[PDB]
PDB file of N, CA, C and O in Angstrom:
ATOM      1  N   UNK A 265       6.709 -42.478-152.001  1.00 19.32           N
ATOM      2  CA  UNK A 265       6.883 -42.823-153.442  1.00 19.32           C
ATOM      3  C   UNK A 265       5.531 -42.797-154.162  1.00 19.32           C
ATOM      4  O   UNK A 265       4.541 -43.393-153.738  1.00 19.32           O
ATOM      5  N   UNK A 266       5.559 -42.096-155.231  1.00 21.41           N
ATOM      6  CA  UNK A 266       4.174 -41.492-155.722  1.00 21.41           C
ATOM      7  C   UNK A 266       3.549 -42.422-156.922  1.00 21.41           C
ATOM      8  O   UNK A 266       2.402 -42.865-156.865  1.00 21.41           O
ATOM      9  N   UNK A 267       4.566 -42.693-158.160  1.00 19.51           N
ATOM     10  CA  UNK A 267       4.459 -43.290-159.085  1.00 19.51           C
ATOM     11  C   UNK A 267       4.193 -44.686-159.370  1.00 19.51           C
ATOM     12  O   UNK A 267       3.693 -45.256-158.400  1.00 19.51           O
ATOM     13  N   UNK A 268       4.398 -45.557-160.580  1.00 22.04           N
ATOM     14  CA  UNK A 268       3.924 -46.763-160.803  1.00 22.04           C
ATOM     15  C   UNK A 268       5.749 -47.061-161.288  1.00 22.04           C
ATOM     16  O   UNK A 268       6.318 -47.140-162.377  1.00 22.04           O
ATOM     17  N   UNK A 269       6.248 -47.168-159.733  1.00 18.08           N
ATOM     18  CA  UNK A 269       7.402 -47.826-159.574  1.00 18.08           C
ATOM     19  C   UNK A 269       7.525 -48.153-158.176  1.00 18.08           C
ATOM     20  O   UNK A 269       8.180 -47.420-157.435  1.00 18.08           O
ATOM     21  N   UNK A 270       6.760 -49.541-157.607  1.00 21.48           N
ATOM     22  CA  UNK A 270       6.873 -50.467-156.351  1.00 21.48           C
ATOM     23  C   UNK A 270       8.088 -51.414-156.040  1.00 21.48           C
ATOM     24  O   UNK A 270       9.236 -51.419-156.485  1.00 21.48           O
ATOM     25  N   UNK A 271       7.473 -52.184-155.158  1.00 21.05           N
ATOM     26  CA  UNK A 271       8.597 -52.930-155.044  1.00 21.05           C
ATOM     27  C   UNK A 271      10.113 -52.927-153.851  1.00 21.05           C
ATOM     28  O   UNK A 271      10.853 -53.818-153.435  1.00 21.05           O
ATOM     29  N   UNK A 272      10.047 -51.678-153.671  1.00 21.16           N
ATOM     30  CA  UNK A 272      11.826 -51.058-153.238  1.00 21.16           C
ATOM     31  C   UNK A 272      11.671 -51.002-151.712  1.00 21.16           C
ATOM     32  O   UNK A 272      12.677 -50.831-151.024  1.00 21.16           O
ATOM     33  N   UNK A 273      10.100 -51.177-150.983  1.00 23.77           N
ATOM     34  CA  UNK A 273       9.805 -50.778-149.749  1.00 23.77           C
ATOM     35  C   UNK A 273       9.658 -52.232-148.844  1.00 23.77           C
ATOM     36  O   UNK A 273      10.067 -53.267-149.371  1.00 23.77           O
ATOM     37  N   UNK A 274       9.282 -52.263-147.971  1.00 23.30           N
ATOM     38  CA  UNK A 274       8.584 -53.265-146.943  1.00 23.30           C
ATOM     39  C   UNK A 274       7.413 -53.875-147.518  1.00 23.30           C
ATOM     40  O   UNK A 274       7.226 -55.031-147.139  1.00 23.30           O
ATOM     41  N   UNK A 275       6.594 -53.418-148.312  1.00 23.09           N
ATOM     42  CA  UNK A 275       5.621 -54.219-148.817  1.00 23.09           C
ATOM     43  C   UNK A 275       5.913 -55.892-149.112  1.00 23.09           C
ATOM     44  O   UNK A 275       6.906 -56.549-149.426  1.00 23.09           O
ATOM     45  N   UNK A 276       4.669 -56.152-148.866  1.00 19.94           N
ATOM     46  CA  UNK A 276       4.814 -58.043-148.611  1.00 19.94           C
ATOM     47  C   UNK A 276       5.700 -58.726-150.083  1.00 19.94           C
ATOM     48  O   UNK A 276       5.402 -58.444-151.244  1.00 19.94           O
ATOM     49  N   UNK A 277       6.459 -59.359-149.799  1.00 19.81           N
ATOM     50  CA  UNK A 277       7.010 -60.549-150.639  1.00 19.81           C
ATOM     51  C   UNK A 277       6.052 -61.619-150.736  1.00 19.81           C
ATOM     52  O   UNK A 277       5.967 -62.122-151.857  1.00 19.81           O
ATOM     53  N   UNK A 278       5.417 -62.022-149.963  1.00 20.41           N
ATOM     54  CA  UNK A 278       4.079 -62.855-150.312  1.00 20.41           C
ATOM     55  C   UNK A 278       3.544 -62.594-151.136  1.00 20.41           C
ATOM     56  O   UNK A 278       3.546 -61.363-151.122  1.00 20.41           O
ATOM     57  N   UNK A 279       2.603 -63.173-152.593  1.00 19.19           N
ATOM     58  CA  UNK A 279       1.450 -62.751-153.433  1.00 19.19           C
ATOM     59  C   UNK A 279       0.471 -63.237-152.698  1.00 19.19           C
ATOM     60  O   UNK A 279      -0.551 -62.749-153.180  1.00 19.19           O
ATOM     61  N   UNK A 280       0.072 -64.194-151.447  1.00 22.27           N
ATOM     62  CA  UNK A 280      -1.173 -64.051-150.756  1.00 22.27           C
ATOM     63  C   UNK A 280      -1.460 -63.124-149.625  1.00 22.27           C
ATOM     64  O   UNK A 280      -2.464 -63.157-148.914  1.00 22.27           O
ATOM     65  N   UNK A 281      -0.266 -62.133-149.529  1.00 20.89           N
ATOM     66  CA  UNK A 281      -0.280 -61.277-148.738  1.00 20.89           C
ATOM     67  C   UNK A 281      -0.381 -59.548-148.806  1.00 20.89           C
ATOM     68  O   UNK A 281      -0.402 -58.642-147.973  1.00 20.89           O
ATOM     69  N   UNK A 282      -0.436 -59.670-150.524  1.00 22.65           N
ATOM     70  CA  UNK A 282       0.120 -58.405-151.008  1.00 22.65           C
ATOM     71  C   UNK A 282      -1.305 -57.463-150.731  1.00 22.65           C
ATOM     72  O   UNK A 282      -1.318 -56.287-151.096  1.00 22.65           O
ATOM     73  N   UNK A 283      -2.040 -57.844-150.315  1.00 23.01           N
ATOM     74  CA  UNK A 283      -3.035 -57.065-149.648  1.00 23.01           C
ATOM     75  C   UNK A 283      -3.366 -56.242-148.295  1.00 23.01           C
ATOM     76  O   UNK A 283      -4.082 -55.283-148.008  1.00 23.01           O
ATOM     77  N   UNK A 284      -2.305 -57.276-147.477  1.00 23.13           N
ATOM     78  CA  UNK A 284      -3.119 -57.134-145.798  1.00 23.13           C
ATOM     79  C   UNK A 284      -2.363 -56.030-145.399  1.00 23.13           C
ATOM     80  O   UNK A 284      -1.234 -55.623-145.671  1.00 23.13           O
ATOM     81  N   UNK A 285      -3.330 -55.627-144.642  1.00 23.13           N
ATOM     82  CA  UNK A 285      -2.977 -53.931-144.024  1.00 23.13           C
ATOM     83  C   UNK A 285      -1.636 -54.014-142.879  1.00 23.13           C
ATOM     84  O   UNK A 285      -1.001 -53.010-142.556  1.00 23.13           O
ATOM     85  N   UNK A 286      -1.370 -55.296-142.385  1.00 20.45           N
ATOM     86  CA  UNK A 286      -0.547 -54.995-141.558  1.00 20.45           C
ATOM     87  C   UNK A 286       0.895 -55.957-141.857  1.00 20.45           C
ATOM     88  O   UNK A 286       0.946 -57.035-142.448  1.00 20.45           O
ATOM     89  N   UNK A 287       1.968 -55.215-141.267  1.00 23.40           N
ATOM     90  CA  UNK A 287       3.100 -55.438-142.056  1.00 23.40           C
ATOM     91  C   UNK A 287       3.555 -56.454-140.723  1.00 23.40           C
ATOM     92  O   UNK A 287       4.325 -57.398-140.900  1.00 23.40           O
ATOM     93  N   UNK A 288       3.155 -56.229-139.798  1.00 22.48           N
ATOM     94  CA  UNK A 288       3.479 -57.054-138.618  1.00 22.48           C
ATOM     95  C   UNK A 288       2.992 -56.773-137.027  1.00 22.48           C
ATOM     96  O   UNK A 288       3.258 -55.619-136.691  1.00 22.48           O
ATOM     97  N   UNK A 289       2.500 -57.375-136.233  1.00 20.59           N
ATOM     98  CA  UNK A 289       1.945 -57.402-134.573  1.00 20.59           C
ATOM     99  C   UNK A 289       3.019 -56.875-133.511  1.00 20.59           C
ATOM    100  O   UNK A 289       4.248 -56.949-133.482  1.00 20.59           O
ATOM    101  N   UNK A 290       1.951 -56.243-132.540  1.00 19.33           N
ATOM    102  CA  UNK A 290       2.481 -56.012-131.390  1.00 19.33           C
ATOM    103  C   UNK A 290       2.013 -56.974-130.401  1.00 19.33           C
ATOM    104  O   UNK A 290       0.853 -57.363-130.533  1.00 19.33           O
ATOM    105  N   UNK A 291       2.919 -57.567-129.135  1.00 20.52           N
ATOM    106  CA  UNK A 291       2.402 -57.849-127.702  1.00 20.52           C
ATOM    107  C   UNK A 291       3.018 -56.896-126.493  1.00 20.52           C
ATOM    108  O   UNK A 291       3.698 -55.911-126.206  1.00 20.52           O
ATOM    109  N   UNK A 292       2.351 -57.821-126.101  1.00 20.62           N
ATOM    110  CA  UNK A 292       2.710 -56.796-124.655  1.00 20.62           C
ATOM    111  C   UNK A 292       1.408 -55.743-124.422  1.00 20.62           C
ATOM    112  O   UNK A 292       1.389 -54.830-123.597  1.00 20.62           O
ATOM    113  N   UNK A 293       0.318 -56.107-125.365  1.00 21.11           N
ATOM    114  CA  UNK A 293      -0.850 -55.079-125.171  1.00 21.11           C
ATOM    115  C   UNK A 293      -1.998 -55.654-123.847  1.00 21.11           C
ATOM    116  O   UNK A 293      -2.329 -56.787-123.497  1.00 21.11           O
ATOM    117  N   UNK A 294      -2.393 -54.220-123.337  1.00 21.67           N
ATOM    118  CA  UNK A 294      -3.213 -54.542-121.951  1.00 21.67           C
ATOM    119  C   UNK A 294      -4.436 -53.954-122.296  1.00 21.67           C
ATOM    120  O   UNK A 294      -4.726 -52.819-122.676  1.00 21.67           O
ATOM    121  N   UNK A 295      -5.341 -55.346-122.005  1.00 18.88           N
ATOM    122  CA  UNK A 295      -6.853 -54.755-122.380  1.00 18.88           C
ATOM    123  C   UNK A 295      -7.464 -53.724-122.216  1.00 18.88           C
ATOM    124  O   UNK A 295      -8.457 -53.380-122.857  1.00 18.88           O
ATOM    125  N   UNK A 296      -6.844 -53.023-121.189  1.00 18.79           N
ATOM    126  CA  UNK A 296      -7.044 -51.950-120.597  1.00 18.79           C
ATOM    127  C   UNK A 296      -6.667 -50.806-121.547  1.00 18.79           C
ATOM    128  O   UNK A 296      -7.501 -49.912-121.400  1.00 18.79           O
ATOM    129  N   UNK A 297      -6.014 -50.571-122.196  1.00 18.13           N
ATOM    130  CA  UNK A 297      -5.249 -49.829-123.548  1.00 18.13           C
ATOM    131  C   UNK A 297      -6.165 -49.640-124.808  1.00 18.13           C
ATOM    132  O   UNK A 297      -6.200 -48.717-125.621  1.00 18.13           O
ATOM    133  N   UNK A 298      -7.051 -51.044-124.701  1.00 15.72           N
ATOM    134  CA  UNK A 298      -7.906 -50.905-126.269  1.00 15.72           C
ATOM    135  C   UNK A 298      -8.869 -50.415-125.969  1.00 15.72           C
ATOM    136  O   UNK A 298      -9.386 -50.463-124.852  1.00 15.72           O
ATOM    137  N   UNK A 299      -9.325 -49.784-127.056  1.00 15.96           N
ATOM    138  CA  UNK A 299     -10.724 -48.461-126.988  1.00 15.96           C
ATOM    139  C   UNK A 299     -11.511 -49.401-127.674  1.00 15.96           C
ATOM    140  O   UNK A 299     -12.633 -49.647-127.232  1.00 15.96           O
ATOM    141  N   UNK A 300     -10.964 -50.152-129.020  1.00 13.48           N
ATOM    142  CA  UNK A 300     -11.839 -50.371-129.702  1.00 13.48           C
ATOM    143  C   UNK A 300     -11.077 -51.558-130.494  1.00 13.48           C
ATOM    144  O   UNK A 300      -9.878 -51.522-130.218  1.00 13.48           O
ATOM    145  N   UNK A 301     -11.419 -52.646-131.433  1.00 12.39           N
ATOM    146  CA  UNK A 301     -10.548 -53.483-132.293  1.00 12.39           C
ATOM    147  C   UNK A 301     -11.321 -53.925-133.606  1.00 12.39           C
ATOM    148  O   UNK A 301     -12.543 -54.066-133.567  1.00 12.39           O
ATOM    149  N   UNK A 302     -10.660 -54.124-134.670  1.00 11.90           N
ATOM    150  CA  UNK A 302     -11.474 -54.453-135.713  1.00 11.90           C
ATOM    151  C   UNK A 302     -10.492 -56.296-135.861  1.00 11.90           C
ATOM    152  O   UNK A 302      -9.385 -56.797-135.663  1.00 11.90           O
ATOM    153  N   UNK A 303     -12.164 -56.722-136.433  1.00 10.62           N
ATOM    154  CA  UNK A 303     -11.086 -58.569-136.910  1.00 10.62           C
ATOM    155  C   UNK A 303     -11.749 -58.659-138.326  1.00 10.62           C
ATOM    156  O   UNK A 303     -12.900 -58.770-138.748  1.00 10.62           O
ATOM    157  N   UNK A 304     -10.408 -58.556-138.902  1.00  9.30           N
ATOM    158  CA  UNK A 304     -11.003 -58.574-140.253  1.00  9.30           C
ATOM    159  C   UNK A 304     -10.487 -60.276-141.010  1.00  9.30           C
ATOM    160  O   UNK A 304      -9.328 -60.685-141.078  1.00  9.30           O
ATOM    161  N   UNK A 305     -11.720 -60.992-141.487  1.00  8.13           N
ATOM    162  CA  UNK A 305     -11.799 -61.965-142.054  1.00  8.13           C
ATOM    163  C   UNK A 305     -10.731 -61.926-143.463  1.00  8.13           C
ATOM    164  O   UNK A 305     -10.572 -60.830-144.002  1.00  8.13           O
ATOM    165  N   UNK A 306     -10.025 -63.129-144.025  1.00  7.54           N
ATOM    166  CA  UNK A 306      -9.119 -63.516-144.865  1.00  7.54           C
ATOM    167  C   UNK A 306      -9.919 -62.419-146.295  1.00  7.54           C
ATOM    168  O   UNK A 306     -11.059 -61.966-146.397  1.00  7.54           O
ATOM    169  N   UNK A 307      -8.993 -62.340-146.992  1.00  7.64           N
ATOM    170  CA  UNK A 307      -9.569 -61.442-148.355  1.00  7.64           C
ATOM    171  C   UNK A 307      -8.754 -62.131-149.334  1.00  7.64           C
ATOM    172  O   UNK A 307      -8.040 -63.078-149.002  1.00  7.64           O
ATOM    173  N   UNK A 308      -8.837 -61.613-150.777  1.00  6.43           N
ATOM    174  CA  UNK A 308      -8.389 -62.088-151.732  1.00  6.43           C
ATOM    175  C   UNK A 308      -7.024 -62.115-151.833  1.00  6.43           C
ATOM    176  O   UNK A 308      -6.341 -63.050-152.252  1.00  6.43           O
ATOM    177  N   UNK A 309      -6.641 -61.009-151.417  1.00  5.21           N
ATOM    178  CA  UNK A 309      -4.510 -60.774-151.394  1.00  5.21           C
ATOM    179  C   UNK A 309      -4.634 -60.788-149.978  1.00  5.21           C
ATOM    180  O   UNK A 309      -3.616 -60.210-149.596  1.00  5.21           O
ATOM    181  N   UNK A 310      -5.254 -61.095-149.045  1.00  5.32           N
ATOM    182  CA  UNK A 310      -4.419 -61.344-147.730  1.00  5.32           C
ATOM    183  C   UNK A 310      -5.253 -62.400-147.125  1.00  5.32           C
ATOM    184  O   UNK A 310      -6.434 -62.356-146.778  1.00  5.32           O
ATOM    185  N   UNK A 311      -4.357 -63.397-147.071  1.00  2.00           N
ATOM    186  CA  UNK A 311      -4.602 -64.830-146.674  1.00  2.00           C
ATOM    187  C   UNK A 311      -4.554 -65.036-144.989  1.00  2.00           C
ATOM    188  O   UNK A 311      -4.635 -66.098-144.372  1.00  2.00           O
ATOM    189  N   UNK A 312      -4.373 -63.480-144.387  1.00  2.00           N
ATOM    190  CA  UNK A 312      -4.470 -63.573-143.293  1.00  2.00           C
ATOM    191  C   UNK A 312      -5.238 -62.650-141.817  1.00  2.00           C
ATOM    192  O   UNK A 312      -5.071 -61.474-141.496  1.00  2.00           O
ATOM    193  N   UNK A 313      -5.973 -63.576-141.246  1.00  2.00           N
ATOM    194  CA  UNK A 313      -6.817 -62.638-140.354  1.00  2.00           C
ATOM    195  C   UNK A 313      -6.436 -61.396-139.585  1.00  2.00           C
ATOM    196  O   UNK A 313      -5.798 -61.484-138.536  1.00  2.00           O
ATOM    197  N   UNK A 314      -6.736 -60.492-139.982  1.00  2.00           N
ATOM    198  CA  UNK A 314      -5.640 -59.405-139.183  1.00  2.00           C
ATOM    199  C   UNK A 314      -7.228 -58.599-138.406  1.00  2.00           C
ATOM    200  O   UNK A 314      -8.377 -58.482-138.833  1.00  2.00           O
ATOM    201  N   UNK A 315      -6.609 -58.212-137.220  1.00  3.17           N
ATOM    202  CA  UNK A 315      -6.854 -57.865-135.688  1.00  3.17           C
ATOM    203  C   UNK A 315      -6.113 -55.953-135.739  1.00  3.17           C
ATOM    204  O   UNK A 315      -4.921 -55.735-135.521  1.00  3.17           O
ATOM    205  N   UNK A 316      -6.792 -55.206-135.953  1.00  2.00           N
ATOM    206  CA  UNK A 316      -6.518 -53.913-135.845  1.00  2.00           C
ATOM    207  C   UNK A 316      -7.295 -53.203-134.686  1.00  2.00           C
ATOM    208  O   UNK A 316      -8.447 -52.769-134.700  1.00  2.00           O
ATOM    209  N   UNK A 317      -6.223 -53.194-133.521  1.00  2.00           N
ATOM    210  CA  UNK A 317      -6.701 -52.634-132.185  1.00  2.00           C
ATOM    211  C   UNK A 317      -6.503 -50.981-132.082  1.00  2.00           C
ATOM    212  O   UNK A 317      -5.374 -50.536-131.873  1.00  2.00           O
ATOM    213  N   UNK A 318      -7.333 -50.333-132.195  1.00  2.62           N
ATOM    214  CA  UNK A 318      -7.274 -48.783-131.702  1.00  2.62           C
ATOM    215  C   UNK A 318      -7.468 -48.456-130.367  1.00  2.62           C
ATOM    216  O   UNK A 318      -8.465 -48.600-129.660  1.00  2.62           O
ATOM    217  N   UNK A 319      -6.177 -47.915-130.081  1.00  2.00           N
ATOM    218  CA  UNK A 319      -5.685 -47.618-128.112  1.00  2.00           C
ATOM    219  C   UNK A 319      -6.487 -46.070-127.469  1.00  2.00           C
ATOM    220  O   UNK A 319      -6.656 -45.020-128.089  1.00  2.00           O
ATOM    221  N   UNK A 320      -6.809 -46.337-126.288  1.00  2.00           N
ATOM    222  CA  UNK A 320      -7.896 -44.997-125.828  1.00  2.00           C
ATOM    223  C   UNK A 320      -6.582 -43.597-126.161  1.00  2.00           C
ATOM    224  O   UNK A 320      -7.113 -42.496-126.307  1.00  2.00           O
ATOM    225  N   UNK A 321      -5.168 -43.604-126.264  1.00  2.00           N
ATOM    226  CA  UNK A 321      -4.622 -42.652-126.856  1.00  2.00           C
ATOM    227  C   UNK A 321      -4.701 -42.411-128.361  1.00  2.00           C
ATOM    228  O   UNK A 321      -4.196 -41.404-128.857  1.00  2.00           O
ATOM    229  N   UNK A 322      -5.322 -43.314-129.075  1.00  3.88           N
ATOM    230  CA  UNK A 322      -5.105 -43.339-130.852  1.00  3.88           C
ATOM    231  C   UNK A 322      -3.964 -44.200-131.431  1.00  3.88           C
ATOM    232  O   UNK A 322      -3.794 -44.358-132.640  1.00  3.88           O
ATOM    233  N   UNK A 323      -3.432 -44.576-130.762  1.00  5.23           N
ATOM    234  CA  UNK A 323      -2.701 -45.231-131.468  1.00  5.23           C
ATOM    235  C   UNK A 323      -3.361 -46.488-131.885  1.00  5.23           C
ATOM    236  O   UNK A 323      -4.414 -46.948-131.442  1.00  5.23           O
ATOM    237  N   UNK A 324      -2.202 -47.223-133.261  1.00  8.59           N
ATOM    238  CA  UNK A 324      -3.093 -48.122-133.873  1.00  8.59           C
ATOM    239  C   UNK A 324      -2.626 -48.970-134.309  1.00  8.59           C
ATOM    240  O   UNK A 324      -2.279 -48.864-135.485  1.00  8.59           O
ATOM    241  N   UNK A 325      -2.374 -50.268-133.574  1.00  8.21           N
ATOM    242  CA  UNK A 325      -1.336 -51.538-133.838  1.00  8.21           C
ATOM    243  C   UNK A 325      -2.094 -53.303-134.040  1.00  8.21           C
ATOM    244  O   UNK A 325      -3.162 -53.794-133.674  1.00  8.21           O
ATOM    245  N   UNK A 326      -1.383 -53.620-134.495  1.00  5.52           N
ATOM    246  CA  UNK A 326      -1.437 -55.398-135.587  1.00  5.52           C
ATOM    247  C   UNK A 326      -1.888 -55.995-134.301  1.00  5.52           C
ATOM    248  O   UNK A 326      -1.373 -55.343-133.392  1.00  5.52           O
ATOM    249  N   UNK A 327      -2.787 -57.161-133.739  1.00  6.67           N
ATOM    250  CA  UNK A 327      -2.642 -57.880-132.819  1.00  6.67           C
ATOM    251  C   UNK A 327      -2.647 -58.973-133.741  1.00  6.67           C
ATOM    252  O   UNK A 327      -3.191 -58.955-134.845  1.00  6.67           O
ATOM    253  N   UNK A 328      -1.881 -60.128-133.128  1.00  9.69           N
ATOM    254  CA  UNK A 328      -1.654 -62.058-133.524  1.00  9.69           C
ATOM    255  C   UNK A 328      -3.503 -62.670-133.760  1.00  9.69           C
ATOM    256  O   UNK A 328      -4.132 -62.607-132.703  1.00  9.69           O
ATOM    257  N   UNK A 329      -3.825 -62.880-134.236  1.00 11.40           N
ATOM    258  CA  UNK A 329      -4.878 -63.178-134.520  1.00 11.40           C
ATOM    259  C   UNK A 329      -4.983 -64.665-133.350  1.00 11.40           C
ATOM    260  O   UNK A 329      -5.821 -64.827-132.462  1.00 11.40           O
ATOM    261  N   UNK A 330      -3.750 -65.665-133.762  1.00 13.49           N
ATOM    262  CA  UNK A 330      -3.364 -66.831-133.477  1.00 13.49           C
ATOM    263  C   UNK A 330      -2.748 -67.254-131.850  1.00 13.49           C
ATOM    264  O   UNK A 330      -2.908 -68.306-131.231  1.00 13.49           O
ATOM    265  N   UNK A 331      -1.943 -65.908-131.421  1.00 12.08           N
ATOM    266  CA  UNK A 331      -1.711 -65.656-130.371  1.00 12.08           C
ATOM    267  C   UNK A 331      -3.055 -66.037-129.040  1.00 12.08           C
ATOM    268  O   UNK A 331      -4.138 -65.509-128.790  1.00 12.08           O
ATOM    269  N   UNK A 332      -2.250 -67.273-128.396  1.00 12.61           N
ATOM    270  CA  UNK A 332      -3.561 -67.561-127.124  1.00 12.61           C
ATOM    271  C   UNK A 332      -3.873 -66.439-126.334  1.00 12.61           C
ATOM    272  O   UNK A 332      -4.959 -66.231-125.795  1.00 12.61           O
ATOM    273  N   UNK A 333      -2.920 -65.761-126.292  1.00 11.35           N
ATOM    274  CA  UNK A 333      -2.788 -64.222-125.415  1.00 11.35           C
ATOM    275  C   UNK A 333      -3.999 -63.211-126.204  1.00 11.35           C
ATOM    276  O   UNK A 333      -4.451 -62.338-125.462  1.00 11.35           O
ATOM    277  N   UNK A 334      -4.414 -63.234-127.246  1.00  8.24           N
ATOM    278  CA  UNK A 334      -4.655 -62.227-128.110  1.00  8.24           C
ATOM    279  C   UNK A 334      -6.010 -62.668-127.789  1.00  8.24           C
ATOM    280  O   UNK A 334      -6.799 -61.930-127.197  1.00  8.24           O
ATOM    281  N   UNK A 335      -6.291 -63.815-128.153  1.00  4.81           N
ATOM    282  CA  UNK A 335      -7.550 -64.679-127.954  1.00  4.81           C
ATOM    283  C   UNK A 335      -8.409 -64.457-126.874  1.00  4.81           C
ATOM    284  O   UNK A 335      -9.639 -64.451-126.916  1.00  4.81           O
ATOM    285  N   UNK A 336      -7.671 -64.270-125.881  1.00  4.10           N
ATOM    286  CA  UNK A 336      -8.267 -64.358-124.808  1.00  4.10           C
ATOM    287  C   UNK A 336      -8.570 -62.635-124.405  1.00  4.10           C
ATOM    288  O   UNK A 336      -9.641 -62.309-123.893  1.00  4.10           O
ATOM    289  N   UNK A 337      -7.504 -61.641-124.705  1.00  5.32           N
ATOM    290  CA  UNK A 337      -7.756 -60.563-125.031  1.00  5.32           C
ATOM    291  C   UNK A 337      -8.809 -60.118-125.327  1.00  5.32           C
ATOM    292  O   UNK A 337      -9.423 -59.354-124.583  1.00  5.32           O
ATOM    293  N   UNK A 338      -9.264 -60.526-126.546  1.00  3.90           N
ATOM    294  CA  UNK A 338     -10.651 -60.298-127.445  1.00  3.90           C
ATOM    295  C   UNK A 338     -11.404 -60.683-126.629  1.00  3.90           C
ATOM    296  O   UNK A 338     -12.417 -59.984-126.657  1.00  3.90           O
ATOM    297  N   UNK A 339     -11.488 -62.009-125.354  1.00  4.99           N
ATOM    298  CA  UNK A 339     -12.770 -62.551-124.990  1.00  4.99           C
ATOM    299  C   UNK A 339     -12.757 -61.652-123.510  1.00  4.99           C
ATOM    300  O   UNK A 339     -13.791 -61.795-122.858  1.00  4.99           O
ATOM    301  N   UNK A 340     -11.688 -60.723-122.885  1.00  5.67           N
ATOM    302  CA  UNK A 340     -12.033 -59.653-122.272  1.00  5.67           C
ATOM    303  C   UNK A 340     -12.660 -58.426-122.962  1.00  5.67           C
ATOM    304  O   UNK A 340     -13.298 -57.521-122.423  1.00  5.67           O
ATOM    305  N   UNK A 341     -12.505 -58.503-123.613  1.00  4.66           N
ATOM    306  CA  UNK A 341     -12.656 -56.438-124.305  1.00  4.66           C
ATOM    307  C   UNK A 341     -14.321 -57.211-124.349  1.00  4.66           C
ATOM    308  O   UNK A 341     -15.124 -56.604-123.640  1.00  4.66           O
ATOM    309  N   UNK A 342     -14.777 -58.185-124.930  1.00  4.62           N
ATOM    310  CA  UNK A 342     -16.325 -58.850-125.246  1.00  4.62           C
ATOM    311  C   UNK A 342     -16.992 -58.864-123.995  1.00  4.62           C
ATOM    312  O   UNK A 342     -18.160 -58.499-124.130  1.00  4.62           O
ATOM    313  N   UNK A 343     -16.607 -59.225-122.518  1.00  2.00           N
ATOM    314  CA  UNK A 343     -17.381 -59.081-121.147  1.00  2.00           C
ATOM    315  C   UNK A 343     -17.378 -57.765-121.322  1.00  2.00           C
ATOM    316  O   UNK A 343     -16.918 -57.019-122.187  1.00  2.00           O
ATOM    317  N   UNK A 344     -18.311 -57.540-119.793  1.00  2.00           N
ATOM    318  CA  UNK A 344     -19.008 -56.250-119.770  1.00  2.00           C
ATOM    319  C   UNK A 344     -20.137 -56.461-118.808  1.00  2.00           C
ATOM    320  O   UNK A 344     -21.022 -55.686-119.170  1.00  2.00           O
ATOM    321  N   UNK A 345     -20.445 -56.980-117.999  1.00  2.00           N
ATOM    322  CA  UNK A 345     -21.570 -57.159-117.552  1.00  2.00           C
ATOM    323  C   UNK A 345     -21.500 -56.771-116.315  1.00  2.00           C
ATOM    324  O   UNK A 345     -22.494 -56.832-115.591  1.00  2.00           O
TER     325      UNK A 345
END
């Protein structure tokens, strides 16, 4: 949909959300899968921390920010030693 007529799609019903890039999370992800992840801090229309993991195939999915699973996720992909 090209024009300045919104509204009709999945886009957020939230107004503190009408920003954030992701419409909703995956689990079931294995550290082993992520190449790479971005954590992007709260913004003006999205009131919420969103976690954008890019997989060593390309693919490119929502992680739970909040999720203990996710958490701990992040504090594998961070070792390395």
């Amino acid at each position: 949909n090209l024009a300045k007529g919104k509204e009709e799609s999945l886009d957020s019903d939230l107004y503190a959300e009408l920003r954030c890039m992701c419409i909703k999370t995956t689990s079931g992800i294995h550290p082993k899968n992520i190449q790479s992840l971005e954590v992007i801090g709260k913004g003006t229309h999205c009131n919420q921390v969103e976690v954008i993991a890019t997989l060593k195939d390309g693919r490119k999915i929502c992680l739970d920010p909040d999720a203990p699973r996710i958490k701990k996720i992040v504090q594998k992909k961070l070792a390395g030693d």
